[model samples]
Target: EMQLTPFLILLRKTLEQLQEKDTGNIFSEPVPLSEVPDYLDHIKKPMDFFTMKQNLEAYRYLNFDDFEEDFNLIVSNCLKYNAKDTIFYRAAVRLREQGGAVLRQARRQAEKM
Candidate 1:
């Protein structure tokens, strides 16, 4: 409600952009533990857009840094767990690089306000 106000708009827009990604559909939800049994063993701190949205809604992020941490983790987790040959790895890389542009713009916008 306070500090979050300036960045909330950018945060939602950033999240929307991420959600629209080709990999967004895959990263939308958390890795299904039942399906990927070894997932949690490797990536202890998992992050997903769905969960990030929940945190946003809950006001868990008092500032942009906290919000960005989850975004960063989503990419890191995917990259760490998936093999280089797999689509998930490639998607994370694409999303990671792609991630910077919007984030940069959003950061600028937040500062302007």
Candidate 2:
């Protein structure tokens, strides 16, 4: 396997933590096209944990902002598509808060290195 950049390594670490905090496996998989046919109509750019991992491994996230944006989208996209009362929307709200802290911790930790 190829090696990861320092920043990506930190991002990967943050993502791993976010997975557990933000509904874990619930949002890990891509929205099923068959199960949720209208997902595409609402979310212009869909994101999921699996894709983020693949992107990290592939070195597609060259900049911290690129990785951060994708991570934010995973939560933001869900909030946009689902009603605020829905579990999905609530989960995203939790993710935005918890995951935001995790990412900031990651950046702060990385800065010292």
Candidate No. with top TM-score: 1
What is candidate 2's lDDT per residue for 1-113, written digit by digit as tens? 22356677777888899888855476797888899888898889889898999988898986667888998999889889989889888889898898898888777766665
- TM-scores across all candidates? 0.90, 0.89
**TM-score of model 1 relative to the true fold?**
0.90
Off by over 4 Å in 1: 1-3
lDDT of each: 0.82, 0.82
lDDT of 1 at 63: 72
lDDT of 2 at 58: 91
Q: Model 2 — TM-score against the truth?
A: 0.89
Write candidate 1's Cα lDDT for 1-113 as tens digits.
34656567678888888777645488898888899888878897989899998888787876778988899998999999989999889999988888867677777777776
Lowest lDDT block of 10, candidate 1: 1-10
